Amino acid sequence: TQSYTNSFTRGVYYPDKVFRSSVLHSTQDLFLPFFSNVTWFHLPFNDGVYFASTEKSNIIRGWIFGTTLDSKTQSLLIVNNATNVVIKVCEFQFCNDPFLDVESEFRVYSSANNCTFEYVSQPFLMKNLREFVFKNIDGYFKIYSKHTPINLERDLPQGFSALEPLVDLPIGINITRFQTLLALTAGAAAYYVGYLQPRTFLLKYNENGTITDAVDCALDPLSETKCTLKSFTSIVRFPNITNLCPFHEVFNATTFASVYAWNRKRISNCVADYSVIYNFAPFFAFKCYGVSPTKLNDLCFTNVYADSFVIRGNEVSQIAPGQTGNIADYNYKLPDDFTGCVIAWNSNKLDSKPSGNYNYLYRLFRKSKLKPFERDISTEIYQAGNKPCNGVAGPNCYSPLQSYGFRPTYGVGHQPYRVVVLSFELLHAPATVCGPKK
Amino acid sequence: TQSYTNSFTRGVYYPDKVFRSSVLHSTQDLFLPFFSNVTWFLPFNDGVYFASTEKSNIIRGWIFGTTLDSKTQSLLIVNNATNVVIKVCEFQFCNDPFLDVESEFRVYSSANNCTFEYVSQPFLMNLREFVFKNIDGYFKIYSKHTPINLERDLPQGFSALEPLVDLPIGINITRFQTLLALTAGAAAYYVGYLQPRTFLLKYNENGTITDAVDCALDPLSETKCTLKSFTSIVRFPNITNLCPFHEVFNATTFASVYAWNRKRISNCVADYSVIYNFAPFFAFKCYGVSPTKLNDLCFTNVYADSFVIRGNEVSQIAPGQTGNIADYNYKLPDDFTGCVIAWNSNKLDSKPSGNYNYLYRLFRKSKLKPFERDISTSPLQSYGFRPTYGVGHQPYRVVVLSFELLHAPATVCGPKK
Amino acid sequence: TQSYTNSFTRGVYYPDKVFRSSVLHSTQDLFLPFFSNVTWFHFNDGVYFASTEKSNIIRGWIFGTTLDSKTQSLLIVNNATNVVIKVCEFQFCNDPFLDVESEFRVYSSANNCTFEYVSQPFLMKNLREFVFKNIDGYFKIYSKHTPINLERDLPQGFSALEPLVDLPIGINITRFQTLLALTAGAAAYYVGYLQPRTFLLKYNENGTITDAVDCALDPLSETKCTLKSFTSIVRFPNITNLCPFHEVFNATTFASVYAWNRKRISNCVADYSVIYNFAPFFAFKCYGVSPTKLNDLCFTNVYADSFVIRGNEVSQIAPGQTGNIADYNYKLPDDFTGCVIAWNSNKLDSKPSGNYNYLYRLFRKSKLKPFERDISTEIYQAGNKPCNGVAGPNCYSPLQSYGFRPTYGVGHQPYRVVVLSFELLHAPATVCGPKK
Amino acid sequence: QVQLQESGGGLVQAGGSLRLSCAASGSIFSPNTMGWFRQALGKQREGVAFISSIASTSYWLPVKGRFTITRDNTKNTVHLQMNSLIPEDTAVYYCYAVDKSQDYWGQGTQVTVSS
Amino acid sequence: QVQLQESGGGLVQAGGSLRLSCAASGSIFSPNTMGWFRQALGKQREGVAFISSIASTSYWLPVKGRFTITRDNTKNTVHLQMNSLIPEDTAVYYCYAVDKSQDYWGQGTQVTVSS
Amino acid sequence: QVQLQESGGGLVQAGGSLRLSCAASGSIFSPNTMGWFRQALGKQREGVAFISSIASTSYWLPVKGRFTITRDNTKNTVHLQMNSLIPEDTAVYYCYAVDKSQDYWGQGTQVTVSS
Incomplete structure (x- = not known):
């Protein structure tokens, strides 16, 4: 009480x-x-x-x-x-x-x-x-x-x-x-x-x-x-947002080419909003290494690089720093200290036909490995025997490129997958690229 | 136009x-x-x-x-x-x-x-x-x-x-x-x-x-x-003597490393153009003085210690460094001021059968405190130099210039007027 | 004469x-x-x-x-x-x-x-x-x-x-x-x-x-x-004991950083010889007091913290510093008064298959106040419907692990870290006995 | 010194069921949080699921229906009920007791499903 | 837009010769590699031949010494010649430009050899 | 410029005796040490024996009795008495004047013994 x-x-x-x-x-x-x-x-x-x-x-x-x-x-x-x-x-x-x-x-x-x-x-x-x-x-x-x-x-x-x-x-x-x-x-x-x-x-x-x-x-x-x-007697105003970096172009291109011939796009001199990225389907792989995905809009750099290609379903794990594999050292090699993000999603419904889709090729044989951030385009007979190949195939003379195959009846792990990697870098120049700002 | x-x-x-x-x-x-x-x-x-x-x-x-x-x-x-x-x-x-x-x-x-x-x-x-x-x-x-x-x-x-x-x-x-x-x-x-x-x-x-x-x-x-309204003289002593740097160099007879020649240079005008026109020196280092600024200062005394060392042991001539040549032959003080120069002499002191007129120390009881050499005399082993020897083993002539500052009015300085 | x-x-x-x-x-x-x-x-x-x-x-x-x-x-x-x-x-x-x-x-x-x-x-003459x-x-x-x-x-x-x-x-x-x-x-x-x-x-x-x-x-x-013209007594307390610094070190089991152990030490003679006696420490830095004079002072109460950090992140532990673990796992106050010790453990806390056994938090809604610990495993909300279920889309799950193999170079090998914090100007101090 | 007892693993055919259980004895202070981590053969270690002391659950995988966590307050133990087993979950399991001072780990259990 | 124009196919009796050509227009960066691939109804894309910017010619086993390639640097076009045709060669051909970027394929050329 | 005069060499039968002599004129500064080195035909140069200025002797071979060193302080010369010759000492001989700063070398004396 x-x-x-x-x-x-x-x-x-x-x-x-x-x-x-x-x-x-x-x-x-x-x-x-x-x-x-x-x-x-009481x-x-x-x-x-x-x-x-x-x-x-x-x-x-x-x-x-x-x-x-x-x-x-x-x-x-x-x-x-x-x-x-x-x-x-x-x-x-x-x-x-x-x-x-x-x-x-x-x-x-x-x-x-x-x-x-x-x-x-x-x-x-x-008392x-x-x-x-x-x-x-x-x-x-x-x-x-x-x-x-x-x-x-x-x-x-x-x-x-x-x-x-x-x-x-x-x-x-x-x-x-x-x-x-x-x-x-x-x-x-x-x-x-x-x-x-x-x-x-x-x-x-x-x-x-x-x-x-x-x-x-x-x-x-x-x-x-x-x-x-010592005695007892909040307002924030900023320029109007116009110049948006185009990310809906590096996405849904419908033509991602092959892994051995991967397109590189440089993005600069625009405001880059990463929200639209999450507007697509749930992603099979979404991994950011050097940057926390929450704070991409908070920290900004000089220029951005985007690389897109199509790889097999089970080869997704090979696309990471420190990895080794046929796709890792012969088609696309990544630096150990890579800073950026990797996105990968299935495109079996869009990159497979009942007869057979063989427009996606990849390197199979190469004399040596590939340095990080490098591509190889030349197509010459990979000589395996002591005798010269003389520009023709035959015994120990095989072509270096092999064509992938996709059909809708295939199981998981082989269906075509679209992979887009975003890479970020700094240098002695004004950034000129920062995220949207209210 | x-x-x-x-x-x-x-x-x-x-x-x-x-x-x-x-x-x-x-x-x-x-x-x-x-x-x-x-x-x-x-x-x-x-x-x-x-x-x-x-x-x-x-x-x-x-x-x-x-x-x-x-x-x-x-x-x-x-x-x-x-x-x-x-x-x-x-x-x-x-x-x-x-x-x-x-x-x-x-x-x-x-x-x-x-x-x-x-x-x-x-x-x-x-x-x-x-x-x-x-x-x-x-x-x-x-x-x-x-x-x-x-x-x-x-x-x-x-x-x-x-x-x-x-x-x-x-x-x-x-x-x-x-x-x-x-x-x-x-x-x-x-x-x-x-x-x-x-x-x-x-x-x-x-x-x-x-x-x-x-x-x-x-x-x-x-x-x-x-x-905020709209309504330098330069003087130097008259002595003109040239410093005897040329006599120390190209003497056609360099002593053994275990008994290095020490020469005192003073009361003259020191010119270091002979240093650069002498030869394409293999090693040219300086510690207390910038090598390119040796032409603009006043100095009291100069010491020149000349000897012959193997090609791979040239790095052993350095203050605060360890090594057989460092500890038993010749040691530089940690606060040493001066320069070290070294050039190849393979075409001069490499006999076809081998030259044994150069010898070095391997055995001694105590370490060598800087700026002193051993004369007493197998604790000493002779060198071997032949034209067939490759790099890192041909003889090399090494000269250290010991310098001192903060003393009586300097006399060895007339590089400028 | x-x-x-x-x-x-x-x-x-x-x-x-x-x-x-x-x-x-x-x-x-x-x-x-x-x-x-x-x-x-004469x-x-x-x-x-x-x-x-x-x-x-x-x-x-x-x-x-x-x-x-x-x-x-x-x-x-x-x-x-x-x-x-x-x-x-x-x-x-x-x-x-x-x-x-x-x-x-x-x-x-x-x-x-x-x-x-x-x-x-x-x-x-x-x-x-x-x-x-x-x-x-x-x-x-x-x-x-x-x-x-x-x-x-x-x-x-x-x-x-x-x-x-x-x-x-x-x-x-x-x-x-x-x-x-x-x-x-x-x-x-x-x-x-x-x-x-x-x-x-x-x-x-x-x-x-x-x-x-x-x-x-x-x-x-x-x-x-x-x-400019021509016209000693010392009265330290009687109690003799040994501060169990040996127990803090060589415990063969260190906690992950997102849950760092805390040990309070009082009522003993503080002898610091065993520290240098332990190992050639990669880092040993004291901020508010000189590392040599720990053997003649008196303190109210001391705290020992212990965990394991990737080597390149050891510099991340310092007052007024920023970084994932600086603001999300272990925050040090700006007015720190103590010592920090960090030494390599690559031979003991690494495995060829991958000794994970160690976690760290990188997603957290707010910055950490100094000397806080956070132990929640709740799934980080990104600003959308509540993903009580799973990270799924925008939502994420915290606490990635570490991976230690002997093949990794310096800057990724595990380092054991122990931080000693001191208490000054308080109730009558107890941890001092190296002098009579 | 804390001992974590794990039990309930082994060989089960596809679509089966079992009950993993971890009991923590020793110090294990009061406001603890318990969980289960998964280790696939020669891969990384992922967190299957976590239960707190206030019965709050956090499943770190979109897998509800498959695992269910039950808490025994009287003995302070955790049970993971396994139903509808599918072969991609064939991996060893450890239980994880974070306690308040210094977390712990289990020994390991073999869980296998195949057909 | 890169468009490659293919021409020269059709019906030819056994032992005859055909004359295909594809001309590439669009970007075509100078280090270009252009080849030919074979595909029959029921079989997949089979590589016929390749030439790089080095003008080196590479041919596959089934067509040893029977198909040839000529390259025009002025118009940067590719001309494939079929000689000593056999019914096994009954398949549509697609010429493919490797380039340095997004790859472009053809619309196909009908080549039929039967008696 | 110092001159090291060498004398007393030549042909001697087995078991003979001779007297090598080295006189150092010129600078030959006060704290001198006088030594003898041996040079076998096409071989390494080893040291016969050294005498110092304080009469201390250091023989660099188990050869005591064979060589004996005598000093002349009035003229500062060094004499080597050779007795009981054996064919293994057939080698040219030089004297070594360390002086104090610049060591020197002799011209050479041919000592030969055979039977």
Whole structure:
């Protein structure tokens, strides 16, 4: 049963561990803002929690912090008592509703499991108000605490008291949700909960080293003045897009020639949009090596080179840097450090006839290999025997070119496939080629 | 058909594309200085002011070329009644390229490939002025048509030059020519050069330049610019002695490597032309002094250590290097200053039966600290040199010149007067 | 026999060969401080040597380290004709002296030496003063000869010392001795030792030093100099332990970069010898602290990260750097304060068939904040209908593998990388124990 | 130290069915993510399928219907159900446990289908 | 557009001679290679012969010493001569230009030899 | 220019004796070392023996007793006494004056023994 009230000037803790006296200091850290709403109960964690109560019969005796609150996340647990305060961080498989039977942990959690940490110390607890500040930062879990006398009152006392550090655990686990844990059978109790935010305070240390007053730096203009004096008294416009690089020409050419005679096209002095590439059919092979396909429009180069041809279905894997094969070193060789993309798709429906399609040839015999980015066109008898071929065929005299064959009744791996490779390069010249830009 | 004439105040172009109003501005850039010489009728230098005054439009097109042939990239600008075409093709030009009106074979015999094409509204439509400026891979043209009254020379007036086109071609250029179209005809045009200067330009309230003052023409203009308103001796000692570098060289008797000859050269004029005319040295290296700048300094003492080493061991003569010749024969200090020279002597010290007058060390107890040799005397083995031996084993004469600086006033320096 | 006397105003030599006139100049160099005791007989950093005999009985000087034939020894011989300077490791006797003329009593025999020098001898009612100083392989001799009246001790006056010779010898020197040429006899000489000081020299109009004042003798002289005119305890904690750096290294199992292991180290003595003890690291660079001084500092808490990277991408790990793993797999803060170690592993993490066993992420919606880790396997959405199914068309799947074969060259072989990050200026530090 | 047990592989004719299973014992911290990778004979290694700890599944191949992933929360194990086997899936399989600190790997299982 | 014109086919008795020619028009970069291929009804494309820009002549086994090629550099045309014809040569012929780019084929020439 | 005069060679029967003499005139600077090298007919040049200026002797052959070296300090000459001749020492002899900077060589003496 929630409620609201006023936080007044409470919840200031020693930020660090350096002694000071009779000096006004300015600190930037998480704090509870002055005069803020603190929910009064009878829960998200955010960046930290200020928790304050007054029930002096130990009805409040601990807390459970965790992320998902199940075995799926180790749940930090603090339990108070009269003998010894206990802190555990074991991966408790969390139950639906936590409570101690008074004292089996089973209702809290199913089974004790792996925990590299465990801690026990003097009891935290000692008409009296107890205030705690919990926060975990940079893989450390810090608890500050303080207690004070008070007259019977239904809201936070007017006045001032600083909070001294209590524990500083090196745990380093994520927490996003916490839950209190009372000591009842039904009943009810009371406590106050508030949330910290980053702020800039001005703290005043008296002669004995204890904080005795502090002023906020964002509450109201008077406080801003007190802090300053250090005393207590999208639009984007760009040219219209006209010059589009033509990619629908290097595509659906309907004449990709042979692999041994592959057309090379140079593209420059235009805006190149790669979106239209994905407007065609799903591609059998779509591989980019030196460039992530997402960022092609973001990074631009000097000139582009496109090479298109038709190869067999099972020979697609051979078209890559570092590959070896009949198509790899005799018809088209690629550099090891090739930067660009490769596209390949089936064209059996367009490059096959029942009688037989033999207009797609390829080199079969060659004296040596081919350097990367090279073509060979000459057709001479490949001499194999010791005797000269003398420009004629026969024994150990075979032609270097062999004709591929495609028919619609063939199975996968042999059907004709169209392959287009895009290559990109840089040199000492203006790029003059970049992608579309809004 | 040359002549010279005065430029008056012409050739001022908007430095950039910025709009300003009623504010005097100061700029530092390339301009044609006031009252210079311009030629009346070609190197390019840094930019060009070009002007003509014919109404028949016979002039058409500038041929920018570095090689002025089909060998290297050339910019060709052609103009006709409908369009202007800019090409980077390296045409095969002739001696007197001129149009026919319409065959272009007269201008150039043949064509080839290139990597640029540009087409636009023709440049031309009285005096016509252009400014050509190429810089950092950008070719910029500024143009202006000014109607002049019946007059002879460039008018006493002012007219700004507005940008026409920028092209990112990125090729160097050095020359250009003139085209004519044909019967007898008459042509005449003015040409002037650019220079880096500082100008003060006055904008009116519509953005058009109206006046400008050079910042170096005369002291009054210097005052206007600064106020920003419109209202070596060489001496050397007299000793003339020649340094005995020739005696050290070509001595016909070089000592063994294990006992290298050390000579001290001082109190003379050192000349190193004998170094280069001596022979085509196989190895010529210097560490503390640039080899080409040995002619312009003053030196205190010179040391010359001469010996004979095998062809493949020449690299062993180097500061901070390890090797048998380095550690047991002769070592150079890591901070050694001087030079090392080495030339082949196969045709001199290679007996048909072998020459054994040269010997080297292989065995010693301790390493050799730089600049000391061993005389005590099988710990020492004689060399073998024959004409049949190939490269890497023929004898080589090696001389090191040890140098020192930062000492008493130098005496060995009279290479210059 | 020995005795003592006061140096008085003596031992001032032209610091440089620069002409000046009528200008007071401040110099900082080695001098013999005023009013000091110089030993009278009947090396350190320099020598003031003085004598007054006329019979030319005094001559020669021996400088060396061992006074034996095992190290080079400067030898300065003088006779009526010339002066001879040699650097030979002579076998000196107990009491060397010129026979007058054989040198067999001086030493046994000649041996290895380089510099041999001959010139006009230094020596020519008369007192002779010399200053010998060795610095940066250079041996400088300054001299002066004065006509001294019949006086027992050093005269009260001023005499500058001109340079005489400057030799580029370069020999380690620790001691020197003087020889005599004799029938018994007796002779004496004064020896004093130089120290670094600051002097104020006064040049007259002719270019010759006439007077000088010591800047650290008495407050009056300090005033003259400034006016420029003539009118350990260590309390480290008790705990002794060993930081398990051995466990971080040689674990035989390293995580892939997109899930990099994290190990926290505290409460132990940090000894870094084992690091260099491990291997010849290809890269070992420390940003916020010098690599040599890790063995005498104290830190709050240290973190060790370990993974494997393709060699050419090792440079990708640095503050304020860009690259696929820089922004997508492992981000280092701009204010990093630690060390990075990277060494080749091509012999252990490669296979002929292809040791994949290692992944890296290249598709990610947003840039990585520093010291983040991302472990999701969700299929990257390219900006279209949600491809929860598969990459398919525009959508893609991340985490390609690596391929390591021994055949790959450097720049594709695997390198094991370990990054140590430090914590400074915090709660009372715990990882420091290399000192008592 | 983490041990991954794999089971269920072997020889099956075309169109068959089987059930691969990987169980992770040891440290295997709570917010783990498990998966299966495929290794064809002398080829690269591809990721068959991945299941998270929040039951979210990511199949890295257009293959749904063929594999199905089931999760056993109580023992923290993963089962891959194999149906309608076709010969191009004849490859060995490993399971992949990413955990939170340092991922792991299995030993290997032979899955074969032919006719 | 590259168009190659083929001519010279038809019907001829056994032992006769025929005279085919194809002339290429269009781009035809200078390093051109032009050949002839045979195709009969029911059989695939069989290479007849080739000539490169080096003017070298290459012929296949079935037509040893019976077909010849002449090349015209002025018009850059190809002339194929058939001598000693036999019914095995009954097939349509296509001349093919290798060029350096997209390859162009012919419309066919009817050659019939039968008795 | 230094001159190394050589004398005392010739024909001697087996078991004979002779006295080779080398006198070095000219520069022959003070820290000199005088040696003797042997040259067999068409073979490598090995060293007979060296005497230094401090009377130290270094024989480069297990030949002690055969050659004996005597020094003349007044004229700074070196004499080799040859006794008990055997045919294997039939070789020409040169003397080697290292001097201190520029080493020199002799002209040559023919020493021959046979029986």
